[PDB]
Amino acid sequence: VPWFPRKVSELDKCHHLVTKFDPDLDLDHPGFSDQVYRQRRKLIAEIAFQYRHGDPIPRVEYTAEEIATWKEVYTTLKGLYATHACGEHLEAFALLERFSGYREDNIPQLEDVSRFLKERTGFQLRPVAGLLSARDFLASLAFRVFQCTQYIRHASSPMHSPEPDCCHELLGHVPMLADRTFAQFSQDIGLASLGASDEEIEKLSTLYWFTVEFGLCKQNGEVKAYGAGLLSSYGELLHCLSEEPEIRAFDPEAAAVQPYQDQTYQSVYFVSESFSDAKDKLRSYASRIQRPFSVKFDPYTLAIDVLDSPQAVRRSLEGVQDELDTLAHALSAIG
Amino acid sequence: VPWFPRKVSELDKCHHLVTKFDPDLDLDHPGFSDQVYRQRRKLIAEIAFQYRHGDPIPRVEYTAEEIATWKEVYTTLKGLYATHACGEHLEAFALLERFSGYREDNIPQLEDVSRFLKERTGFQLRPVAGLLSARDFLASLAFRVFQCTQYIRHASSPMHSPEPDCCHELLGHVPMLADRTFAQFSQDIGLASLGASDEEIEKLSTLYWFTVEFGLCKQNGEVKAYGAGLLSSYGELLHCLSEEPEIRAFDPEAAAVQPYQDQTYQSVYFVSESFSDAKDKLRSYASRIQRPFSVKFDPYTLAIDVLDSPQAVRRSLEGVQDELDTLAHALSAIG
Amino acid sequence: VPWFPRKVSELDKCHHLVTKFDPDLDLDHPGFSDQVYRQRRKLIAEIAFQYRHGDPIPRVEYTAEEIATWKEVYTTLKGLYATHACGEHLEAFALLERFSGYREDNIPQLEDVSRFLKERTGFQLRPVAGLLSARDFLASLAFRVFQCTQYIRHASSPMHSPEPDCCHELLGHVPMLADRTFAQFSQDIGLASLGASDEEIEKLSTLYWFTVEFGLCKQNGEVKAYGAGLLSSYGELLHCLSEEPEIRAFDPEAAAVQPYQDQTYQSVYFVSESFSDAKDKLRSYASRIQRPFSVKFDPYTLAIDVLDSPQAVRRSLEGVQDELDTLAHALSAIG
Amino acid sequence: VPWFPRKVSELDKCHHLVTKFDPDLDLDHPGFSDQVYRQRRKLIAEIAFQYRHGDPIPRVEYTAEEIATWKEVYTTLKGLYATHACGEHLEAFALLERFSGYREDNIPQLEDVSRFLKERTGFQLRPVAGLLSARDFLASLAFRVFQCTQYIRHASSPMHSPEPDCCHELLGHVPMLADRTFAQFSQDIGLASLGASDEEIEKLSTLYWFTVEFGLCKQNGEVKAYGAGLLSSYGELLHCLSEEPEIRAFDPEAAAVQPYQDQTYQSVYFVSESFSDAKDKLRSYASRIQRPFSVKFDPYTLAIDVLDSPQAVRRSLEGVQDELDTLAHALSAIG
Amino acid sequence: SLIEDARKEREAAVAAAA
Amino acid sequence: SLIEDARKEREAAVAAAA
Amino acid sequence: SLIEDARKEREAAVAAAA
Amino acid sequence: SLIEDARKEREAAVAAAA
């Protein structure tokens, strides 16, 4: 069984120690030839690499070009997010822009959103650089923390980015997982990932790409999109609800085998009319996923306690019937 | 119904806004005539008053006198905590000193312990100055956060302090509420305090004084003390297990009427052989405490949702049978 | 709100008092012109009408004709139930015939099956005559008791009966609701029927006709039938899995509006691949069914306690977390 | 592990087959020299021995002497049960006499009370003769059925009986275990008895003698008696609340070692102020009782399913969160 | 014919009401 | 006398074992 | 002195009410 | 490209095993 973390503390020390001394090259990628980008990536990596849990996010400045590009994408998205987009995005985005300060003139930092989520939703942000493995990111995603980056795309290609950047997640990921239901949804994916074999690691990752990154929802009669990648690109949004790509009902097992493509638009999509349907299907998927154990999340200490003995089930119990005891007061004092 | 907070955010903004522009006088108290103490209290108040939630604790320096006094009390307590003290203190104190750094040479800060608790126990620390009301402190204590101060006693009287200080709680409170059981115990007291009438506010506060501040435990056959005030004074510890003071079994209703005394040793004490007995008795006490509502704690966002409708009970439910659903995996995958 | 029973006692006294002095005419129906049938119906009605709860079923004799007809249908059904039929029927029918004594030579009584069900499944049988209303039968079906009759079809028409008879239910109903899952399924239908308005009474009754009387199941890859009426007629079984009738997926709301036909084969059918799917869909159907109350079943006394106050929810609770307490022993003593 | 039953069916067939061909001698006991008593015991044994589960209790006649004696004890007890007796006895006895027909002129049968209990409480009665072992009776008492006898004491000694008789239980046992709480209490004792070792068998049996047969309750300020033996003898009732016998608080472990006496009044008694206290203490007693398994009771079929695998815990679960699902309707439709 | 048993309910029910 | 009914258990039980 | 902190509550509370 | 991040896992994983 591959080693997996149990507390947020070792999510920091070892996954940054196993990933020490590793810069991003991306030379052959579009752009990334300007020296200023390399200097920025150095500063971006330095803040991310030596960051420790519990510490506030070190605020990073933003010069003229990034905000000027941030003008372009942010202005284009609000005029188009009013259509084609999921309903939960709308009141969230309005809630984000009025409180957190999602505006064209001011580029948002990471501390303000990080404070904003755990105030309501419970997700923390975390800077990172280099090549994110599949296992390190799911371990973070398991603990109700979303791994993130603070640098943005290249000014040469503001319409699309070779790799997900800051604006990709603060506009595609962050608005989505601020939801009560999807956060519980997103957490379930991470929960099944604890100690899963490499073959299984691919499966839910494809599901994560096929549900969180590109997912369709059916509410108010019409179909809408809630994918992170869907709500992070301009041309994708036009293609997403267009009649060219093939759209089918979501299926955990089916989405775990179907392949992908890169640098091109996606022609395959999965739709879930309700996030309740979304949870309880990969819920059944995790049921058939064999493991020598299971995993329980403790929100009182933000840790993971392993489950290979019926005894380990015990120190979860008095908490479980605790509410069913505390439900007495609420359902006694009432009336 | 008096106003009560629901999230950690308003625990900060209003309870520091209702308590703005209020310095501590304490002129007639023993000591507090040196100007350096007044200057220190200014610095202590400034750090405490303008502190905001989510921010790390601003580290405060400590000159020769406070640590030199910190030498005296810390050295005297370990040689005596080996006896007369609760068992849960012992492995906690050893755990605290080796990790957090509870030593005579180094005075502990607040960030390191604050990190240490929520790593395992889930309590945050919070600086404060001035006169703490009964309602503001219970609102903090409800949210699984312990209000605290960073200044220490006067060097003139290191044996006893007129008011609880930094060393009083980091040695009397902090070692105690690092426990799984007592933290759940301490939280229950805070839960009942939400919106309680002023008469009720006195009751559990006396219980807090009569259980957390001065409490006796019966384990391993012999009787031991776990009170915060009990394990914060040298002369008290000798008097606590001495045969002079009257010791009786703990009773929530009985402890809510019996009075106290100041500047003198306590002759009355309550003993609870098990913290499980300790929880479920004031649990019954809260049952007879009338309220126009009840209160539920949400650890996913560290907030409070009010309970005056059966509907409000609903958005607590799918979480409640969530584990009883997730208990399936742990109790299916096993065996 | 129409009056509805709460205990098995008043299921007997009033529903037989509201239905006193009412013989069945059925003169225009096929057959029913022989005097022996009228004399038999008198004896059948007498046993049924004056029967009281708790008493054993009075054994009724069976002369040459009924068993000779019972030879014909029973022999024809086993040679055909081996095909086209639900899997749960097969081991149940073999279990019934070996223990209860389902054979061609011996016609089964009612006491032996009544003993057999509550030994494993928990359903009691009850004789009845006359015109069964919709409300009286659902009240019985709610209490995990199945209303039944002991007389059989006319010898002139053994292939089909104008009204359900003894052999119809002991071969169509009894084999089905001996299942753990379907009994819980069947009970759920009855539970929603408590005090429901006349419009709602029609709905679940149509569902009862469209699920219990004629229902399709998809197991082992192929589709099978579990309807009571489906597994009670010879020609129906040939028509049921034939390609002429239209077969569609089961839907509670859709099945509640779609009409029926009489004296002719059914062309519309609903299929449920799993009885778990079958329960939790009309479960959602009952959610949108408005009622000024709800209903809970108590198996310790076989009674119904009304639910219009949160207080009434209380005397259900200590039972609910009783197992979650008794689950401790099973999940403690183990390992 | 000694063999133990799992369904009510084998409670009948084997425990009457292991106890075949065994008459009661009781020659040296007071009385029992009249031939009419021997002839009555033959008739009493015949009805009891060949009785099968599910069948109604065969009504037994009662000639002049038994009812004439039944006049004496019944008249003496009501004039004294108004004092010294438990509160739950009072409204139960009035409820019994008005409905079941507890009167001096008419001696009650067994079918009427048997119907009356499972109408509300859920206990069935069962005739028996000969020497009842410890294991056979607890197996019955486990299944929420009370083993009983229909013959009464000797007319020579109506004040006291050498062995418990019909009037002893219909006046000492039956009035007590008609309670919601005590029935759940009585059931808990039986539950722990499943497959327990012979040493353990003695323990709870002594508890059964020390709680059900002779138990004291503290309600309405004063102390009252609810023991079956306590409320079955005239002289005992005077001695029970008299100041001569020693009375102490109830303790499961303490009551399991303390001995008894025969043919003389008891000087030791245990008092439980609340039956809730009574349940949850032997609840903890069963926790420390080691077993290679545990036992769960299923009221839907009145059977016992063994618990030696976590899998066996599973087929108990969907029932457990079934109410927590059905609690939704009651707590949704309300308000 | 149980649907007809539902169809028998209401005219007798509503004519009693009417 | 049910305790004596427990006291009757074991000599018959252990002598059967013995 | 937290009980005195309860004892400080009410005269200020009731005199504000008064 | 996270699927490719799954596609990068195993040759490095199995060649380490190999």
Ligand SMILES: NCCc1ccc(O)c(O)c1
């Ligand atoms: N009471 C409605 C008529 C009825 C009764 C019993 C049945 O099995 C059936 O299919 C239909």
Ligand SMILES: NCCc1ccc(O)c(O)c1
């Ligand atoms: N079988 C043990 C003897 C016994 C039987 C019934 C009783 O009520 C009682 O007190 C004692």
Ligand SMILES: NCCc1ccc(O)c(O)c1
């Ligand atoms: N706010 C009430 C005063 C107080 C504050 C902190 C303590 O630890 C204590 O014992 C008493």
Ligand SMILES: NCCc1ccc(O)c(O)c1
């Ligand atoms: N670590 C896998 C690469 C990745 C990282 C973040 C994303 O938002 C995303 O879509 C893909």
Ligand SMILES: [Fe+3]
């Ligand atoms: Fe992304």
Ligand SMILES: [Fe+3]
């Ligand atoms: Fe203190």
Ligand SMILES: [Fe+3]
């Ligand atoms: Fe039918």
Ligand SMILES: [Fe+3]
């Ligand atoms: Fe008795």
